[PDB]
Structure 1
Amino acid sequence: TYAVAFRLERGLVFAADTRTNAGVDNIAQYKKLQLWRQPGERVFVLLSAGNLAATQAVVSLINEHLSQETDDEVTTLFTAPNMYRAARVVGDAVREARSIDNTNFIFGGQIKGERPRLFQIYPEGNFIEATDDTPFFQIGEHKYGKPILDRVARSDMRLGEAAKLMLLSFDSTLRSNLSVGMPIDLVIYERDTFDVTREKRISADDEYFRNLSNAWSDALRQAFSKIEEFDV
């Protein structure tokens, strides 16, 4: 399990792998990048990590509260005024699941009236917003991929440029840890569009990611061979 998302000037980008520790012994493929949309008004993307039962409980409880009543009983994703209050709908859904009987999320999107805003939800219920200083979040097996993010990330990056960095974060994680595994569900979002046309599943057979990994490997192999060792 590993997911990453960026907050930029041009908009938001999201990414998450599919491999999970579902069974006690077995491992299975499950899509973690959830999506909600009302074209014109608003867009939401929810990346998820941790326990799959508790993850799917929060996703199911969000979809239940939307579809149950036309009459406004409580604040839902579509009925919330701004993204801070939209994050609270996800936060209360985590509290609801724990009440009913280690889930970390990355909730992000945009509502008309304000800019795109990215958040990270903790297991307790509370959350934090992304800023230009630290323009991304991670959940699940984050430590393998963080080194390259800390070096080259920037809030002024382009949307496709951040997708290189985010996918290179997976490339480090995939070789080391076997908990993370392809395919990867990536979703780019442009500012003030309110529509999720830009989306792709990147499988193991994919040739862009093959060229990405080999070109990056060659660069690190070439750069490492030039490093002097006579001074130690």
Structure 2
Amino acid sequence: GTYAVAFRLERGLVFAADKKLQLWRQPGERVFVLLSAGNLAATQAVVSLINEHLSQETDDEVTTLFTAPNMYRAARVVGDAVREARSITNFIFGGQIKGERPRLFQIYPEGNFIEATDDTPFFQIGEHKYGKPILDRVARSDMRLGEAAKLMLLSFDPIDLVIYERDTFDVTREKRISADDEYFRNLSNAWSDALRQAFSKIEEFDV
């Protein structure tokens, strides 16, 4: 049982999962992040299929993550791996390729996918989609990368956190957040206090 979440914003992408977060990169050219909610076998099978084609593909017509000209094509690669791993839950796949905006996708068991938009700028995967009502109401596509990360982190209620900045083509802001992290506890405590105050205000309204 795992939970993972990702946000597409104007300033880039943010990924979080409580391994369940996988990274591919060609410096200055392309970056990809895959989040998994499935069991260990399912995750390893999909990753191994992706890496098999990166490491051993003889046919140059077969698209890999490193030959895909755009993120829609890169998403199809992952979808093929997801569909093909069934012969042995959803995934989240995002990133950026040079000459195109950062893009984010949710991939279903059969390899079909939907893309994140400004209207629906985030995806959740896992058995329980923790804090979906809060994310629906508060998440906005013009948020700073740090804001979005804080909002995502509050929905985890272990945590590997990646912030990807637009047009950098590298993942440097990588972070493991523990349950013993005092910063994360102060944020969570403040959120509880803010929720109680928010409810106290809206108590004004009837039925």
Provide the TM-score with structure 1 as the length reference.
0.82
| 2:10 counterpart SS class | coil
Separation (CA, whole Å) in 1 of partners of 2:67 and 2:43: 22
Q: CA deviation at 1:151?
A: 1.1
- Given the superposition, is the C-alpha separation of residues 226 and 94 from structure 1 closer, same or farther in structure 2, using an over 3 Å criterion? closer
**Deviations for 1:121-144, whole angstroms, at most 9, x for unmatched residues?**
000110011111010011014433
The answer to whether the 8 A contact 2:161-2:176 is kept is yes
> Percentage identity across aligned positions?
100
Separation (CA, whole Å) in 2 of partners of 1:203 and 1:78: 33
- Given the superposition, is the C-alpha separation of residues 74 and 170 from structure 1 closer, same or farther in structure 2, using an over 3 Å criterion? same
Matching residue of 1:78? 66
**Deviations for 1:58-110, whole angstroms, at most 9, x for unmatched residues?**
0111112111146636211001111000001100111221234xx31000000
Q: CA deviation at 1:160?
A: 0.6
Matching residue of 1:178? none
Separation (CA, whole Å) in 1 of partners of 2:202 and 2:87: 56
Separation (CA, whole Å) in 1 of partners of 2:87 and 2:100: 33
Q: CA deviation at 1:222?
A: 3.9
Separation (CA, whole Å) in 2 of partners of 1:77 and 1:216: 39
Q: CA deviation at 1:205?
A: 1.4
Q: CA deviation at 1:154?
A: 0.7
- Given the superposition, is the C-alpha separation of residues 46 and 231 from structure 1 closer, same or farther in structure 2, using an over 3 Å criterion? closer
Separation (CA, whole Å) in 1 of partners of 2:114 and 2:72: 10
Equivalent runs, 1:156-195 vs 2, <5 Å: 156-171=142-157, 183-195=158-170
- Given the superposition, is the C-alpha separation of residues 123 and 226 from structure 1 closer, same or farther in structure 2, using an over 3 Å criterion? same
- Given the superposition, is the C-alpha separation of residues 120 and 228 from structure 1 closer, same or farther in structure 2, using an over 3 Å criterion? closer
Q: CA deviation at 1:168?
A: 1.2
| 2:124 counterpart SS class | strand
Separation (CA, whole Å) in 1 of partners of 2:29 and 2:205: 62
After TM superposition, the runs of 4+ consecutive aligned structure 1 residues lying more than 6 A away are 229-232
Q: CA deviation at 1:220?
A: 2.3
Separation (CA, whole Å) in 2 of partners of 1:230 and 1:87: 46
Deviates more, 1:71-80 or 1:38-47: 71-80
Separation (CA, whole Å) in 1 of partners of 2:202 and 2:24: 49
- Given the superposition, is the C-alpha separation of residues 7 and 228 from structure 1 closer, same or farther in structure 2, using an over 3 Å criterion? closer
The answer to whether the 8 A contact 2:90-2:106 is kept is yes
- Given the superposition, is the C-alpha separation of residues 227 and 57 from structure 1 closer, same or farther in structure 2, using an over 3 Å criterion? same
Separation (CA, whole Å) in 2 of partners of 1:50 and 1:59: 12
Equivalent runs, 1:81-96 vs 2, <5 Å: 81-96=69-84
**Deviations for 1:28-78, whole angstroms, at most 9, x for unmatched residues?**
xxx311000011100000001123211211011111211114663621100
Provide the TM-score with structure 2 as the length reference.
0.92
Residue segments in structure 2 that go unaligned for 5+ positions in a row: none
Residue correspondences, number? 205
- Given the superposition, is the C-alpha separation of residues 141 and 95 from structure 1 closer, same or farther in structure 2, using an over 3 Å criterion? closer
Separation (CA, whole Å) in 2 of partners of 1:83 and 1:95: 18
